[PDB]
C-alpha cells in the first residue's frame, strides 16, 4: 500500500498545500486559471481566520465589559438602598453617598459605550461572514480527487494555530471522506482540546454566549460558534461533519505490519512500554507476544477511544491538573496518565537510553514514526517528521 | 490635661505593659505576689494566642480537605453514573472505569482520615479554652484603676499581630471604659479590618464555618469566632463589648488645641491637605480659617465615621482594589480614596517637601503626631511615635 505523512489536521492552507503536493487533489480541468483559483482560496482562508480572531477578541472584551457593568450597577443600587434609609439629619451622609456614586455612574456610562462600540464591530463582522463561506464553497466545487490509492496519516502539528481544526479543515476532511480516501488522524493534545470544545457546541440547550466561558480559548471552537450563531451552519450539519469525517479517523496509536516488523505511529515520541501502560488504563488485555498480537491490542485501544469519545468522557483520559510538566512526565506520572504522556512527551538526551525504544522485540522488528520533536535521534528505525 | 501615646490597640501584653508603665492600672494591694500574677497573665495570653493560631490553621486545613472530599465524591459518582449506562459488550470500558475510580476512592479515604485527625485536634483545643478564659477573668479581678486623669491616644500599630485586637484587648478596653478612662483610638488599616470582620460575627444568621470564607485571615476574627462557637461568649456579649468600649473611641483624625496652635493626630504620616480631601469624601463642609474651624471640621469627620460605621458601610471608604501601592498613592489616588491614604501612607524623602506639612497655617501653628514610620523627619513640629 501507498502511504504519506502530514501533521495537521490543519490549518486549511497547509492541508490544501499538502493534498496538491501529493496529487491527492487537483483542480478540475474546467478551471480557467489554476493559480488564480488557488490564490483565491488563500485569500478566503486568510479572510476567515482574521474574522474568527476578531470574533474571539470582541467576545473576550464583551465578557470583561459585562463584568464591569454588573459590578457597577450592583454598587450603585447598594448605595441607593442606603440613601433610601437615611434620616433627615444625616445630610452630610447623603451628600457623601452621592459623591461615592458619581464615579461609578461614570464608569457605568463608559462601559456601556464601549459595549455598544464592540457590538457595532461584531455586527459588521457578521455581514462579511456569509459571502466568505460562499466563496469557500465555490472553491470546494473547483477541485476533484486524483490518486485514491494513497493512505494519509495525520500525526498532528505540535503547535496549535498551525494545525488547527477550523471549519475549512473539517470540510476538507469530509471531501476526502466522500471521495473514499483512507484518512487516519493520530490524536494530539490539540485534537483532544478540539473534541472537548465541540461537545459543548452540539449539546442542548444550544450554547449561548455568555456564559460559563471561560475558555474555549482555542480558535477552532470560536469559528464554529460564530458559524452556528449566524446560522451559516446548523448543529445537525456540524454534528454530521464531525461524526462522519473526523471522529472515525482518530487513533491513539496506529501501526502497519511488514513481513517481520511493526511500525508504531504516534504524535509524540514515546517509549515502547507506554503501550502497555495505555492498555492498562483502557481496560484492554495487553498482548506483546507477536506483532499480530500487538496490532490486535492497538486496535482494541482505538476501539476503546471510540467508546470514551461516544460517551463524552475523554477529559477523564486527557486532563490531569496534578501533572507538573506533561512534556517531561515522571515514571509515576506516566503510569498515572498514559494517554497524556502519549500526546505531550518531548524527547531529550536523557530519554535516549537503551531499552526506551527497542528496534527488535519478542522476535519482531519495531519502527517508530512520530510527529515533529526538536530532538533528533540517531536511531535508524526512528522517524521524526519535519514541520 | 495629661495625655499619653500608645500604638495598639493590642496586643494584650503590650497594652498591659503600657498601662502599668504609665500608672493607669496597678495590682490591688491584696495580691500576694505582683510578679507571680503578672507572669500568669503573660502565660495566659501566650496560651490563648497559641490556641487561636492553632484554630485558624486547623480551620484552614479543614476547608481545603472538604474541597478534596467534595471533588472526589463528585468524580466517583459521575463515573458511577456512566457505569450504570454501559452495555453488555463494553466489558473493557467497565474495567477501565473501575480502574479510574480506584485512585479517587483512595484519595477520598485519605482525605476523610485527615479530616478526622483534624477534628480530633480541634476538639482537644476546645476542652482547653474555658479554663484559659477563666484564668484571664481571674487576672482581670486582680487589677484596679490608678490615675484616672490621663488621656490615652492609641495611634495604631503599623503591623498586624503586634497591635491585634484580640478578645483580651477588647476586655481591657472595656475595663478602662468602665473606670472612666478617656480613650481615643485612631483608626488604622488593621482597625478597619477588625471592624469589617466583627460585623460578620454579629449579624444573623449567626456565622457558621464554613462557609463563604475565604478570609477573615486576621487572627482577631478567628478568636472571637472560636469563643462564640464554644459558647464562651454570646453574640449579645460581644456586641455589647464592641459597641460600648471600642467603637465610640474611634477617630479618623484627632486633635488638641493650644492657645495658638493645633496638633493633628493620625495613624500614618499625612499631608495637611489630606484633611480637606477627606472632608470632601465624607460630605463635610471644610473650614480652615481658624484652628477652631479646623477642629470643628475634624469633629464632623469623626461624626461621619460613626454614621458609616453604624450603617456597616466602612468598606466603601477603606477598600479600593484599583490602588496600586497604598503606601505611595498618587495624587489622583489620594483624591480618590482619602481615607485609604490616611491609614496606609509611608513617608520618604520625596514627600518631605515644603508645604506638605506646614508648621504655620491661616494664622495658627500646626503640629503633627503620628504612629511609627521608618522615615525620620527633621521638622521640630513632627512627632513620629516609636515602636
Residue numbers in the entry:
A (entry chain A), B (entry chain A): 24 to 410
Show the paper's wording.
The protein, however, degraded into shorter fragments, the most prominent of which had a molecular mass of 46 kDa. Mass spectrometry analysis of this fragment yielded a sequence coverage that included amino acids at the N and C termini from residue 34 to residue 411. A construct of this core domain (termed “WipA411”) was therefore produced, expressed, purified, and crystallized, yielding crystals diffracting to 1.84 Å resolution. Its structure was determined using the single-wavelength anomalous dispersion method applied to selenomethionine (SeMet)-substituted crystals of WipA411. Residues including nine residues of the N-terminal His tag linker and the protein sequence up to residue 410 were visible in the electron density and were therefore included in the final model. The WipA411 crystals contain one molecule/asymmetric unit (AU) and no metal. The first is between the tip of the α-helical hairpin of one molecule and the globular domain from a symmetry-related molecule and is observed in both the WipA411 and WipA435 structures (and interaction details in B). This interface includes five H-bonds and one salt bridge covering a surface area of ∼550 Å2. Overall, all proteins including the shorter WipA411 elute as dimers.
